[PDB]
Design a protein around this ligand. Structure first.
Ligand SMILES: O=C(Nc1cccnc1)c1ccc(Cl)cc1Cl
Ligand SMILES: [Cl-]
Ligand SMILES: [Cl-]
Ligand SMILES: [Cl-]
Ligand SMILES: [Cl-]
Ligand SMILES: [Mn+2]
Length: 340
């Protein structure tokens, strides 16, 4: 039967079922005040599905010049065309191949560039902003979004939204690699999964995808969502409470040293955006520092709410198109204050 919500992560993660329900705020706000992430499902049923397809981006913007990143080694592929990324998104025989002849796992860097999303893509901008959940928090002019209402004593987010466009990680060796490495944002954000591309020519490979989710420490109810309803899983997230950021720095300082890195004792390994916490490092963080995370599988149409200051990392299971909007809730405004 239809219900307002359910729980993931053994009761530690709220999952809201109706993205446009006028009463979502009554359930959301207590979890949000405690510093928890929140998941909202069903957002892709509210969008214009034809706007959010890799073939459309290629047809409309393919002649633009861009840089790509190789997810396996962080190398930059300079001055190629936007079509060189989009045309290999789902069809593996069309992907750029490395010097070993393997198809590469690529990310589109800074596209659209800076704050140009709204000017370049006005129909997509309207379709996203009118269908974001928790609109008093997430709309540019929402009554609980302080972004437009704060003086320069507060760090204000850039004008959004921002896209996260990257291929799926494939191999056993890729299991320990990040799509986006561990980092934090001083503003709150909502990240929406608007398209999942599953290759059928040499993809749609549950086997290595099921071992990744298992080893990723996904909960039993998340593991039922794969086998039962057949929704399309996009990406594996690990999110940590803002209050645990310094203990994570203490762990990565120690591991850096053990690995023969040469770093001052106050150096910030989260700000460096150089680390991915694999199964070994996540087990050490829990056992040695007492720090537990949220392991979240983001399916098509899932919106992930990421608290200001909360360290997070993402590992794409398949090729993903994600769009995110920043906001400043009153619950977390301390994270962007420039004094004490
Ligand atoms: O040309 C290349 N790779 C290729 C060609 C045809 C089929 N598979 C792979 C290539 C790619 C990258 C670099 Cl830095 C050097 C070369 Cl030489
Ligand atoms: Cl558009
Ligand atoms: Cl709201
Ligand atoms: Cl990264
Ligand atoms: Cl907080
Ligand atoms: Mn982020």
């Amino acid at each position: 039967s239809m219900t307002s919500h359910s729980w993931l992560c053994d009761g530690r993660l709220l999952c809201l079922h109706d993205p446009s329900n006028k009463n979502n705020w009554k359930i959301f706000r207590e979890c949000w005040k405690q510093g928890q992430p929140v998941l909202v499902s069903g957002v892709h049923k509210k969008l214009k599905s034809e706007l959010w397809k890799p073939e459309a981006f290629s047809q409309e913007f393919g002649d633009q010049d861009v840089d790509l990143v190789n997810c396996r080694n962080c190398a930059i592929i300079s001055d190629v065309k936007v079509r060189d990324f989009w045309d290999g998104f789902e069809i593996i025989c069309k992907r750029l191949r490395s010097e070993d002849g393997q198809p590469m796992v690529l990310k589109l860097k800074d596209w659209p560039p800076g704050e140009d999303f709204r000017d370049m893509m006005p129909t997509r901008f309207e379709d996203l902003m009118e269908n974001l959940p928790l609109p008093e928090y997430t709309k540019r002019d929402g009554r609980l979004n302080l972004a437009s209402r704060l003086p320069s004593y507060f760090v204000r987010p850039d004008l959004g939204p921002k896209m996260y466009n990257a291929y799926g990680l494939i191999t056993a060796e890729d299991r320990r690699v990040g799509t986006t490495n561990l980092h934090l944002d001083v503003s709150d954000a909502v990240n929406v999964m608007v398209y999942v591309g599953i290759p059928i020519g040499e993809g749609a490979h549950d086997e290595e995808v099921l071992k990744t989710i298992d080893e990723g420490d996904a909960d039993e109810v998340t593991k039922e969502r794969i086998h039962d309803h057949k929704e399309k899983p996009g990406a594996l997230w690990h999110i940590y409470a803002a209050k645990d950021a310094e203990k994570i720095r203490e762990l990565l300082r120690k591991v850096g040293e053990e690995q023969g890195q040469e770093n001052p004792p106050d150096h910030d390994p989260i700000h460096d955006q150089s680390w991915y916490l694999d199964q070994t490092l996540r087990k050490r963080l829990y056992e040695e520092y007492g720090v537990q995370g949220w392991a979240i599988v983001q399916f098509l149409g899932d919106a992930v709410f990421i608290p200001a200051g909360a360290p997070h990392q993402v590992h794409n299971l398949y090729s993903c198109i994600k769009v995110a909007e920043d906001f400043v809730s009153p619950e977390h405004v301390k994270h962007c204050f420039r004094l004490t």
